[PDB]
Ligand SMILES: C[S@@H](CCCN)C[C@H]1O[C@@H](n2cnc3c(N)ncnc32)[C@H](O)[C@@H]1O
Ligand SMILES: C[S@@H](CCCN)C[C@H]1O[C@@H](n2cnc3c(N)ncnc32)[C@H](O)[C@@H]1O
């Protein structure tokens with residue numbers, strides 16, 4: 001849908017039919033990259049140096065990371081899922097080509113290996129070029145990065161492979177469409193070990209509550225014992241907040257209270273957003289959104 | 295800023311208070327755009343294809359939309375009065391749209407609320423265009439005055455109010471001195487010994503230095519404790535806004551509700567706030583946690 005025309009007259013305007021009647025705007029200092037890839041329109045620009053945002057990436061017209069606020073969602077998906085697992089040794093990231101979630105996952109010394117599968121090889125290349133603080137772990141020996149559709153990759157992966165699966169996708173318009181669907185989650189269930197955890201890109205409670213509720217229902221019905229939605233503050237996602245559905249394959253698991261608190265881990269002090277109090281607070285939902293958690 | 299922010303069928307929230315960014319809402323019809331005695335006030339109906347409904351801006355800053363107004367009004371009204379043991383006399387400085395007053399007046403303990411906003415046109419236009427926000431302005435428990443908040447608290451007795459809620463515009467404009475120490479020395483004085491205050495505490499993304507300065511001077515003026523509560527408001531810049539929730543009495547932990555809303559008859563009519571959201575709001579991202587310790 002959206003491509004180059006979103007930069008016009010000195011600003012980038014995030015106009016999209018997935019959020020009619022609204023658009024966040026950022027002043028453009030310099031366009032660093034702007035081209036169709038094999039799958040998506042990728043735009044990278046340096047924002048106004050008088051403002052805090054730094055370098056900005058958008059896919060299909062939708063802001064994906066900025067320098068200033070990238071840490072939020074990458075620390076919340078990496079730590080909320082791994083700190084809910086008793087011993088997360090093998091992790092899969094679907095999407096995630098900027099490397100941010102992977103960076104956070106590899107702070108855990110329990111992780112033996114993490115596989116990352118993003119459909120768009122140009123996102124990894126441009127993240128290495130323009131966002132080195134986000135992409136700093138893509139070449140780690142504990143990671144294996146492949147370029148491919150995550151729908152096929154989970155269908156091919158054998159049962160009981162992963163302790164945690166993190167699904168860090170673009171929004172549903174575009175190549176991530178089927179990754180918001182029931183067939184994909186049947187496979188995520190299946191490829192988790194019996195005490196596995198998954199979490200995803202759970203969209204906006206202000207814009208997407210119908211889809212978020214639909215997915216919580218079908219994820220429970222595929223066989224996950226518990227699905228709880230965690231909310232976070234991300235200024236450069238539409239309406240300013242994004243969530244993640246955190247799902248436990250096994251019963252008896254309360255993902256809303258950290259099982260292995262980060263504070264007992266050596267890197268808790270390096271984080272800029274997440275800690276155990278923020279983990280517990282993220283599962284408190286506004287009353288209107290409560291029918292995702294119960 | 296003023297009328298020039300309505301541009302190309304969009305309202306664009308361009309401001310020197312947040313350089314290089316701007317939230318924009320599509321305009322279906324402008325209903326009102328005029329200078330008041332104090333501020334530029336603009337009211338428009340947003341795109342019916344989107345959710346926002348009618349939108350009000352002052353000095354180019356979005357103040358309320360029909361769709362998300364309830365968040366900040368519930369958080370400031372209930373976080374403060376649910377932290378107080380029996381809040382019977384309340385003062386709202388600013389608040390001329392009536393939203394905070396609507397939430398305060400849910401409380402059966404309130405005997406009287408004074409509301410003092412400098413701009414009488416805000417009350418007039420809120421009655422005309424936001425009836426679900428402004429109904430409360432006519433309530434006989436309220437006395438609604440047009441005047442500056444700083445002069446009002448300077449003529450107010452010691453020990454007048456159980457709760458003071460400071461619902462202002464951002465610091466550029468007529469609210470400038472309401473973000474200053476001298477104003478808060480009066481707020482402390484006009485509170486009763488068990489009093490609570492809360493304010494419009496700006497953004498942890500854009501205004502952290504100011505929030506640090508205010509938290510410090512509020513404590514130094516004599517409040518026993520100051521805790522910042524964060525909330526999700528799409529139509530404030532960067533998507534979140536806070537409130538410094540301050541206790542005159544020592545030994546009070548405002549982060550846990552003292553008088554929980556769920557015991558109250560109107561709990562299930564609220565759209566955002568409950569006792570879990572109250573406790574959660576005091577958890578701050580690590581970059582900002584030093585405001586609360
Ligand atoms: C950039 S990341 C989100 C930003 C916060 N890290 C979203 C990634 O999802 C990938 N994506 C989209 N659809 C797919 C599929 N079908 N498979 C794998 N990866 C996908 C897309 O190429 C982005 O790099
Ligand atoms: C609209 S309300 C904020 C939006 C969410 N209820 C902010 C009010 O603060 C008033 N305001 C600004 N400065 C002052 C002073 N100095 N005194 C009282 N009220 C003030 C201003 O006229 C708005 O109506």
Ligand SMILES: NC1=Nc2ccccc2SC1
Pocket residue numbers: 062063064065066070073168169170171201234235236237242
């Ligand atoms: N600004 C951001 N936008 C996103 C876009 C897509 C998926 C996740 C996010 S969170 C970071």
Ligand SMILES: NC1=Nc2ccccc2SC1
Pocket residue numbers: 355356357358359363366461462463464494527529530535
């Ligand atoms: N959209 C909103 N904007 C505000 C503007 C000024 C003060 C408080 C708020 S919170 C509601």
